[PDB]
Amino acid sequence: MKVILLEPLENLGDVGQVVDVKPGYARNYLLPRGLAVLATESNLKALEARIRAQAKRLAERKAEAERLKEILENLTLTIPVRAGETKIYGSVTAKDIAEALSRQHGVTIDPKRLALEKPIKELGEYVLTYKPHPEVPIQLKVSVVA
RNA sequence: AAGGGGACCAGCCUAAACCGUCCGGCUUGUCCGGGCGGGGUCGUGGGGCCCUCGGACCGAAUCCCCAGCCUAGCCGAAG
Ligand SMILES: [Mg+2]
Ligand SMILES: [Mg+2]
Ligand SMILES: [Mg+2]
Ligand SMILES: [Mg+2]
Ligand SMILES: [Mg+2]
Ligand SMILES: [Mg+2]
Ligand SMILES: [Mg+2]
Ligand SMILES: [Mg+2]
Ligand SMILES: [Mg+2]
Protein backbone atom coordinates (compact mmCIF):
# COMPACT_ATOMS: atom_id res chain seq x y z
CA MET A 1 0.00 0.00 0.00
CA LYS A 2 1.31 3.43 -0.98
CA VAL A 3 1.76 6.04 1.76
CA ILE A 4 3.06 9.59 2.14
CA LEU A 5 5.64 9.90 4.92
CA LEU A 6 4.73 12.74 7.28
CA GLU A 7 7.92 12.15 9.29
CA PRO A 8 11.46 11.12 8.34
CA LEU A 9 12.15 7.42 8.74
CA GLU A 10 15.13 5.08 8.99
CA ASN A 11 15.96 2.80 6.03
CA LEU A 12 12.46 3.45 4.62
CA GLY A 13 12.34 6.87 2.97
CA ASP A 14 12.08 10.61 3.45
CA VAL A 15 9.27 12.99 4.35
CA GLY A 16 6.91 13.50 1.42
CA GLN A 17 8.08 10.38 -0.43
CA VAL A 18 5.59 7.83 -1.72
CA VAL A 19 6.67 4.39 -0.47
CA ASP A 20 5.28 0.87 -0.69
CA VAL A 21 4.58 -1.01 2.55
CA LYS A 22 2.80 -4.15 3.63
CA PRO A 23 -0.80 -3.26 4.57
CA GLY A 24 -0.38 -4.52 8.13
CA TYR A 25 2.53 -2.13 8.65
CA ALA A 26 0.57 0.90 7.44
CA ARG A 27 -2.77 0.34 9.15
CA ASN A 28 -1.55 -0.99 12.51
CA TYR A 29 1.67 0.99 13.07
CA LEU A 30 2.36 3.82 10.61
CA LEU A 31 -1.02 5.51 10.10
CA PRO A 32 -2.35 5.34 13.71
CA ARG A 33 0.83 7.07 14.94
CA GLY A 34 0.71 9.79 12.27
CA LEU A 35 3.96 8.69 10.62
CA ALA A 36 2.25 8.46 7.21
CA VAL A 37 -1.00 9.03 5.32
CA LEU A 38 -2.75 7.07 2.59
CA ALA A 39 -1.51 7.89 -0.91
CA THR A 40 -5.03 8.36 -2.22
CA GLU A 41 -5.65 10.61 -5.21
CA SER A 42 -7.32 13.10 -2.87
CA ASN A 43 -4.23 13.17 -0.65
CA LEU A 44 -1.94 13.29 -3.69
CA LYS A 45 -3.75 16.39 -4.93
CA ALA A 46 -3.82 17.62 -1.32
CA LEU A 47 -0.01 17.34 -1.27
CA GLU A 48 0.26 21.12 -1.74
CA ALA A 49 3.95 20.97 -0.86
CA ARG A 50 2.87 19.21 2.33
CA ILE A 51 6.54 18.30 2.68
CA ARG A 52 7.24 22.03 3.05
CA ALA A 53 4.64 22.26 5.81
CA GLN A 54 6.20 19.08 7.23
CA ALA A 55 9.82 20.15 6.77
CA LYS A 56 8.99 23.19 8.90
CA ARG A 57 7.55 21.02 11.69
CA LEU A 58 10.65 18.80 11.74
CA ALA A 59 12.80 21.94 11.84
CA GLU A 60 10.57 23.36 14.58
CA ARG A 61 11.14 20.34 16.82
CA LYS A 62 14.83 20.47 15.85
CA ALA A 63 15.10 23.88 17.52
CA GLU A 64 14.00 22.47 20.89
CA ALA A 65 16.03 19.25 20.55
CA GLU A 66 19.27 21.24 20.49
CA ARG A 67 17.83 23.77 22.94
CA LEU A 68 16.99 20.99 25.39
CA LYS A 69 20.42 19.50 24.66
CA GLU A 70 21.76 22.03 27.19
CA ILE A 71 19.25 22.28 30.05
CA LEU A 72 18.57 18.53 29.96
CA GLU A 73 22.20 17.64 29.12
CA ASN A 74 23.78 19.52 32.06
CA LEU A 75 22.12 17.57 34.86
CA THR A 76 22.19 14.18 36.56
CA LEU A 77 18.77 12.66 37.26
CA THR A 78 18.75 11.33 40.83
CA ILE A 79 15.68 9.34 41.89
CA PRO A 80 15.47 7.56 45.28
CA VAL A 81 13.79 4.14 45.06
CA ARG A 82 13.07 1.63 47.81
CA ALA A 83 15.61 -1.19 47.68
CA GLY A 84 17.50 -3.69 49.78
CA GLU A 85 20.66 -1.65 49.20
CA THR A 86 21.29 -3.80 46.12
CA LYS A 87 18.00 -4.48 44.30
CA ILE A 88 15.01 -2.21 43.73
CA TYR A 89 11.76 -3.57 45.14
CA GLY A 90 9.83 -2.25 42.15
CA SER A 91 11.45 -0.67 39.10
CA VAL A 92 11.95 2.62 37.27
CA THR A 93 10.03 3.05 34.01
CA ALA A 94 10.27 5.71 31.32
CA LYS A 95 7.16 7.43 32.71
CA ASP A 96 8.63 7.31 36.22
CA ILE A 97 11.97 8.62 34.93
CA ALA A 98 10.19 11.36 32.98
CA GLU A 99 8.16 12.12 36.11
CA ALA A 100 11.39 12.65 38.06
CA LEU A 101 12.89 14.91 35.38
CA SER A 102 9.69 16.98 35.21
CA ARG A 103 9.53 17.20 39.02
CA GLN A 104 13.23 17.58 39.91
CA HIS A 105 14.43 19.63 36.91
CA GLY A 106 11.26 21.20 35.46
CA VAL A 107 11.72 19.94 31.89
CA THR A 108 9.11 17.75 30.20
CA ILE A 109 10.33 14.87 28.03
CA ASP A 110 8.35 12.30 26.07
CA PRO A 111 8.73 8.95 27.88
CA LYS A 112 8.28 7.05 24.61
CA ARG A 113 11.37 8.56 22.96
CA LEU A 114 13.67 7.25 25.71
CA ALA A 115 15.77 4.28 24.57
CA LEU A 116 15.16 1.91 27.49
CA GLU A 117 14.71 -1.73 26.49
CA LYS A 118 13.85 -3.11 29.94
CA PRO A 119 13.12 -1.29 33.22
CA ILE A 120 15.93 -0.80 35.72
CA LYS A 121 15.94 -3.13 38.73
CA GLU A 122 19.48 -2.66 40.14
CA LEU A 123 20.71 0.46 41.91
CA GLY A 124 23.40 2.35 40.03
CA GLU A 125 24.29 5.08 37.58
CA TYR A 126 22.69 4.65 34.15
CA VAL A 127 23.18 6.49 30.85
CA LEU A 128 20.68 6.41 27.99
CA THR A 129 19.99 8.38 24.82
CA TYR A 130 16.90 10.57 24.61
CA LYS A 131 16.13 10.88 20.89
CA PRO A 132 13.30 13.32 20.11
CA HIS A 133 14.71 13.87 16.61
CA PRO A 134 16.78 11.88 14.08
CA GLU A 135 20.50 12.74 14.05
CA VAL A 136 20.01 14.75 17.27
CA PRO A 137 20.66 12.33 20.16
CA ILE A 138 20.63 13.53 23.76
CA GLN A 139 22.53 11.26 26.14
CA LEU A 140 21.22 11.55 29.69
CA LYS A 141 22.74 10.30 32.93
CA VAL A 142 20.44 8.62 35.47
CA SER A 143 21.20 7.90 39.12
CA VAL A 144 18.98 5.71 41.29
CA VAL A 145 19.64 5.64 45.03
CA ALA A 146 18.08 4.32 48.23
C1' A B 1 -35.63 -21.88 -25.56
C1' A B 2 -36.04 -19.02 -29.99
C1' G B 3 -40.03 -18.41 -33.46
C1' G B 4 -45.61 -18.12 -34.66
C1' G B 5 -51.00 -17.05 -32.81
C1' G B 6 -53.54 -14.23 -28.78
C1' A B 7 -54.52 -11.02 -23.73
C1' C B 8 -52.76 -6.49 -22.27
C1' C B 9 -50.06 -2.27 -23.27
C1' A B 10 -46.19 2.77 -20.74
C1' G B 11 -42.44 4.12 -19.54
C1' C B 12 -39.68 6.90 -15.90
C1' C B 13 -36.47 8.85 -11.57
C1' U B 14 -31.44 8.95 -10.14
C1' A B 15 -25.06 8.53 -9.51
C1' A B 16 -20.95 10.74 -12.07
C1' A B 17 -18.70 15.53 -15.08
C1' C B 18 -19.76 20.94 -14.29
C1' C B 19 -22.09 25.35 -11.44
C1' G B 20 -24.04 27.49 -6.71
C1' U B 21 -24.84 27.69 -1.42
C1' C B 22 -24.39 26.20 3.93
C1' C B 23 -21.45 23.58 7.55
C1' G B 24 -16.62 20.98 9.32
C1' G B 25 -11.50 20.29 8.90
C1' C B 26 -6.38 22.23 9.32
C1' U B 27 -1.89 20.17 5.30
C1' U B 28 -5.81 27.66 5.56
C1' G B 29 -7.06 27.14 -0.03
C1' U B 30 -8.05 27.35 -7.73
C1' C B 31 -7.82 22.59 -0.89
C1' C B 32 -10.42 18.19 1.06
C1' G B 33 -15.01 16.27 3.29
C1' G B 34 -20.57 16.16 4.44
C1' G B 35 -25.68 18.17 3.39
C1' C B 36 -29.13 20.77 -0.21
C1' G B 37 -30.29 23.25 -5.08
C1' G B 38 -29.27 23.36 -10.38
C1' G B 39 -27.47 20.54 -14.40
C1' G B 40 -27.81 15.01 -16.48
C1' U B 41 -29.89 9.98 -17.85
C1' C B 42 -28.04 7.49 -23.06
C1' G B 43 -26.17 2.60 -27.61
C1' U B 44 -27.95 5.42 -34.60
C1' G B 45 -23.39 6.13 -28.00
C1' G B 46 -24.91 9.75 -24.58
C1' G B 47 -23.69 13.84 -21.37
C1' G B 48 -20.34 18.13 -19.32
C1' C B 49 -17.62 22.45 -21.08
C1' C B 50 -16.32 26.07 -25.12
C1' C B 51 -17.70 28.46 -30.26
C1' U B 52 -21.79 29.12 -34.12
C1' C B 53 -26.64 28.88 -36.18
C1' G B 54 -30.91 28.16 -33.21
C1' G B 55 -34.97 28.75 -29.58
C1' A B 56 -45.88 27.37 -29.07
C1' C B 57 -46.72 21.58 -29.15
C1' C B 58 -46.95 16.99 -26.10
C1' G B 59 -48.69 15.66 -21.35
C1' A B 60 -49.35 12.19 -16.52
C1' A B 61 -48.72 6.65 -12.94
C1' U B 62 -50.36 13.13 -9.22
C1' C B 63 -54.65 16.42 -7.90
C1' C B 64 -59.89 18.33 -8.59
C1' C B 65 -65.07 17.73 -10.50
C1' C B 66 -68.79 14.86 -12.69
C1' A B 67 -71.29 10.09 -15.10
C1' G B 68 -71.91 5.32 -13.56
C1' C B 69 -71.76 1.52 -9.67
C1' C B 70 -72.42 -0.45 -4.09
C1' U B 71 -74.72 -0.23 0.77
C1' A B 72 -82.47 0.47 2.19
C1' G B 73 -86.51 0.08 -1.64
C1' C B 74 -91.05 1.34 -5.16
C1' C B 75 -94.70 0.66 -9.44
C1' G B 76 -96.25 -3.42 -11.99
C1' A B 77 -101.53 -6.62 -16.84
C1' A B 78 -105.75 -9.97 -16.57
C1' G B 79 -111.82 -14.64 -13.63
MG1 LIG C 1 -46.12 -14.87 -27.28
MG1 LIG D 1 -30.25 16.13 -8.49
MG1 LIG E 1 -21.88 6.88 -9.68
MG1 LIG F 1 -21.22 20.72 -1.75
MG1 LIG G 1 -27.78 17.46 -7.49
MG1 LIG H 1 -20.47 11.05 -27.19
MG1 LIG I 1 -97.16 -7.41 -10.30
MG1 LIG J 1 -96.54 -4.62 -7.12
MG1 LIG K 1 -100.90 -9.26 -9.86
10 Å CB burial of residue A43 (0-12, 13-18, 19+) is middle
A90 residue type, one letter: G
- Determined by cryo-EM
Distances (CA, A) of A146 to A50, A58, A60, A104, A123: 51, 40, 39, 16, 8
Contacts 24+ apart (CB under 8 A), A45-53: A47/A4, A47/A16, A50/A4, A50/A6, A50/A16, A51/A15, A51/A16
Q: Give yes or no for a contact between A8 and A36, defined as CB atoms under 8 angstroms apart.
A: no
Mention every residue, 6+ apart, whose C-beta is less than 8 A from residue A123: A81, A83, A85, A86, A87, A88, A144, A145, A146
Distance A47 CA to ligand 4 centre (A): 21
Resolution (A): 2.1
**B35 C1' to A93 CA distance, Å:** 49
Q: Which nucleotides of B are covered by protein (CB under 7 A)?
A: 27-33
Contacts with A59 (C-beta within 8 Å, 6 or more apart), sequence order? none
Residues 6+ apart with CB under 8 A from A45: none
Phi, psi of A130 (to 5 degrees): -95, 120
Distance, in Å, from the CA atom of A8 to the CA atom of A143, rounded to the nearest integer, reads 32
DSSP summary character for residue A83:
B
Taking CA atoms, A42 is separated from A24, A36, A48, A84, in Å, by: 22, 15, 11, 61
